[model samples]
Target: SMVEDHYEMGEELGSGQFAIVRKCRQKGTGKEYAAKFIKKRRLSVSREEIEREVNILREIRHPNIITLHDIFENKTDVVLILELVSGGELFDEKESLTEDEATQFLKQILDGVHYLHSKRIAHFDLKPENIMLLDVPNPRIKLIDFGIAHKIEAGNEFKNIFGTPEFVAPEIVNYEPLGLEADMWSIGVITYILLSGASPFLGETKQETLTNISAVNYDFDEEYFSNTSELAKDFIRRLLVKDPKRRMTIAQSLEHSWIKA
Candidate 1:
């Protein structure tokens, strides 16, 4: 049973460096899904690397996270059948949220991340673009893109300097030890942008941005955060700590005054 026999691929839904996601429908059920086709030969990404993402997706299931339905492969690419989410990226909705609305969306993201952390997984890429809404009318947060997600093992040190420049934690920028705290840093950046349309660590150039992130050099400007609540700022403050050890955890984030209030 090959992919072509079970499903029909449609127009491209999205694309990345090594993958193309297209709309697909199951032949028998006529159900829609996103088929992510990862090129095997490109970018030196091995089959095992691709399988790691599949393994992670297969092991986790949460309402606030994207679902994987099936997988298929051919000589050139591996196709992952995933839930169809059409609401658009959370990146598109930046600065369009009130403190109250942002809290709702952030809570869902926190819940999803909390689940991942409980299972010892760290979603290295946790930026707004990877966080999607299910649909516009009935929007639900669906954390997508696990291409760089890694599982943390006890007594094992896994470190990597990858991920989007602005959203990455100081540990990532510094090439230090990484863990679930890295994701918390990204969540803080997302919250900051959600309330203020401005990226906290973004600078004139990529180097500058990376430098800004490494230094944790950002503040709540009056122009963008004049209407923002202090509690909301406090939440961001706690998560964006430069030291991963001192950064807020998912459990603490879920209990924050802004999140609870």
Candidate 2:
């Protein structure tokens, strides 16, 4: 009646502030999974918060997103059994990509984000840390972590200033109403980094970074983007607009000449 009874736990895969992910295997079938263990004592995230993440993961089924296989719990921790993603973080490999390689990665990312948008879900956090690869040889990305994601409902508005400062939208820095457009901004930031190996809005301090985001002050420095294509810059330009209303939507991004080509 417990996780250990059904699956064999292996070495640790990784850890965050309040959770640890470990490799697990089904005893009978020998199927592998990543078991994420979140501490119940951590006040940073409530039971309701954990439940929301689980619900969102259960609702989504996509090749470019991590799959939830099962869940287990104890008095001290809540365990989420997820598909094992063994490759690594996309950030780790950002520097070596060609324009064509970045295009392939961005397309897969857009496809996944588009799927989430179709259901009115906004993945509030879309930084490189959450973008993972299945393997290193010929990698396919898997969007992981749904702790801050939310489902936007008509007539019900939600607003918050959460997410990585460099990847967050101008609206987030300004504390304005947020929607799926926020995710687009993050995708733009991700693409910028993927192509140039530089962060568009990062500053010396967090406050400075946030200020730069709010001001929409970033550019394609020749030092970083000398060899980058104009089409790629145009795609980022459309998504990183100061006005969320004017920012490119997921559908529009998928149709961009850069992505489509």
Candidate 3:
């Protein structure tokens, strides 16, 4: 296999329904990378569609986004050689962050997302687990996981319902046509969780969670947000609006008072 010839595979990093990712190093250069192996049998979508989508992902280059170095095809599986990010998940500890710190990280995230939007791409499945930090203390963030991302041309709307449950926008749940606005709503949920260490729409059951999301029933509990500024809460409120048109655009979000503060 071309992958076996050029890279020395190492530990298994993660796995999904159709793909398994492993750590690997180039044979000669010794540079590390993550090789994602996707089984042909496990794909519900056409292989051609997968290849074309991945090709587009390869072209999206930004400092705050994970890079796709190359792709290799085999009879059994397709392999994706991706730039390795070792800093780990962006939020793992219970440590409280200051508004400035959260704002910086959020700016980086919005910058990356804005770039993707400019390219007509929508990262449909954004969540905290898909975000990585470069290192501890003053970490730079990189948004990962393009598995369910889609390209939407101007005047077009996506009808597919895809995204993590906790972060899923009401439009997705309602089977309504969506666009980049869906992503903005997820960012709002992310911000709420980042500042408060609590999920705004997580109910006891999945059905209940969906209920709360569709109803846009979220709150800035005094217990978790007493230290949080009104500006920050306003930011979250604007993004979590039931009407996507009312949601803040990436440019508007970056210029928000909390982000600028």
What is the full ranking by lDDT, best candidate first? 1, 2, 3
Please provide, for model 1 over 190-210, each residue's C-alpha lDDT reduced to its tens digit, 9 standing for 90 to 100.
999899888999999999999
Give the C-alpha lDDT of model 3: 0.87
Candidate with better TM-score, 1 vs 2: 1
Q: After superposition, how far is residue 190 of candidate 3 from its true place, in Å?
A: 0.7
At residue 252, give the lDDT of candidate 2.
89
What is the C-alpha local distance difference test score of each model? 0.90, 0.88, 0.87
Each prediction's TM-score versus the true structure: 0.95, 0.94, 0.95
The best candidate by lDDT is 1
Candidate 1 structure lDDT: 0.90
Steric clash pairs (candidate 1): none
> Between prediction 2 and prediction 3, which has the larger TM-score?
3
Q: On a 0 to 100 scale, what is the lDDT of residue 254 in model 3? A: 85
Task: Give candidate 2's TM-score.
Answer: 0.94
Choose 1 or 3, whichever is better by lDDT.
1
Find the number of clashing residue pairs for candidate 1.
0
